[PDB]
RNA sequence: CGCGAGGGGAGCCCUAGCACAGGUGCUGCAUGGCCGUCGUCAGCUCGUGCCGUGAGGUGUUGGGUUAAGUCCCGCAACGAGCGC
């Protein structure tokens, strides 16, 4: 499906964030200062939407597997059920430096969840002395907390997406150099030149987060037919 | 072995000689092992990654908690080995 000026803008995508906390290298995409606090001109969003929709649609034509980031407390449980719908991987929780330049070292430890959930099923847990028992069972949670998202990452993301390149321009930085493709929707307090494929428009407007998640993960599945 | 006096042989015994035995002679500052001790103190480290040109750091630190590196939360870390 399309996209259009009418609504990116009752979202809050225009609505970029403050010139106090600014990044000069973000110059091309503004309009300009209606009350010190910026704003976006999506007539320039227009333009790398469309480009950053159609890499999105190869994607999911060459079947490929998109990371999901999104930590700022707001975001989370909309990278959540925006992804799930889409057949994702994501990390909604807290990312972890290592989880792509290091996924071996991290991934020693879903083989650790997938082994901690059949230990659960079985009756063999309950014969260990019920110290381990309480005690295995928090590491239990534990993993299923941090990598909800992380367990159908059984290899190698296609491309990464995130939620603001400035928080998480530590997972950002990490597909820098495992060269993975970087999608990121970024306001204007965000470095726009460490991003390929890329999105102006709202940092923490949780329905600017709402749209763009909720039509990207669209020009996923309808590029999966279904 | 022999019919036989009795010679040969193994053991052990003595005398003489030789291998050598034996030493609580030395050095714990040439060692083994075992012991004491800081100390039953909560500490000591490695892997992969991250960060510095590097020695190195990160992890183990900060805040909360614990008889404890016990654990909870945070963090460029994630876990494991010897301790608890
Ligand atoms: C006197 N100094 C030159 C000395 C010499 C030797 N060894 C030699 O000279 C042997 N060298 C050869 C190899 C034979 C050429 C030594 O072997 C030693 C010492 C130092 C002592 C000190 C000792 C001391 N108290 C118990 C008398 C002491 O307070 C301690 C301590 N740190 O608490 C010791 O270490 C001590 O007992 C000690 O070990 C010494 C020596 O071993
Ligand atoms: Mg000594
Ligand atoms: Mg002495
Ligand atoms: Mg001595
Ligand atoms: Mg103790
Ligand atoms: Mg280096
Ligand atoms: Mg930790
Ligand atoms: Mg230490
Ligand atoms: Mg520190
Ligand atoms: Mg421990």
Do not use: C
């Given at each position: 499906?399309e996209?259009?000026?009418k ?14 906390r600014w ?14 606090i ?9 333009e ?6 159609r ?9 490929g ?10 975001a ?11 057949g ?8 972890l ?8 070292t991290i ?5 650790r969840?997938?082994?901690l ?9 309950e ?10 069972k ?18 190698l ?14 997972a950002?930085r ?11 929707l970024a ?36 590029a999966?037919?279904?």
């Open positions: 499906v996209i259009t000026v609504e990116l803008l009752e979202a809050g995508v225009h609505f970029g964030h403050e010139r106090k990044n000069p290298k973000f110059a091309r995409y503004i309009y300009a200062e209606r009350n010190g910026h704003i976006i001109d999506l007539q320039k969003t227009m790398e939407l469309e480009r950053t929709f890499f999105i649609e190869d994607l999911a034509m060459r079947g597997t998109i990371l999901f980031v999104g930590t700022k407390k707001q989370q449980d909309i990278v959540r059920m925006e992804a799930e719908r889409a994702m991987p994501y990390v909604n929780q807290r990312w430096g290592g989880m792509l330049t290091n996924f071996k991934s020693q430890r879903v083989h969840l997938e082994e959930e059949a230990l659960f099923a079985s009756p063999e847990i014969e260990r002395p019920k110290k381990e028992q309480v005690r295995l928090h590491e239990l949670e534990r993993l299923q907390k941090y990598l909800s998202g992380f367990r159908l990452l059984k290899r993301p296609d491309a990464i997406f995130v939620v603001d390149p400035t928080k998480e321009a530590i950002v990490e597909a820098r150099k495992l060269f993975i493709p970087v999608i990121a306001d204007t307090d965000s470095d726009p030149d460490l991003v390929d494929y890329i999105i102006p428009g709202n940092d923490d407007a949780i329905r600017s987060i709402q749209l763009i998640l909720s039509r990207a993960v669209d020009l996923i599945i309808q999966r037919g279904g």
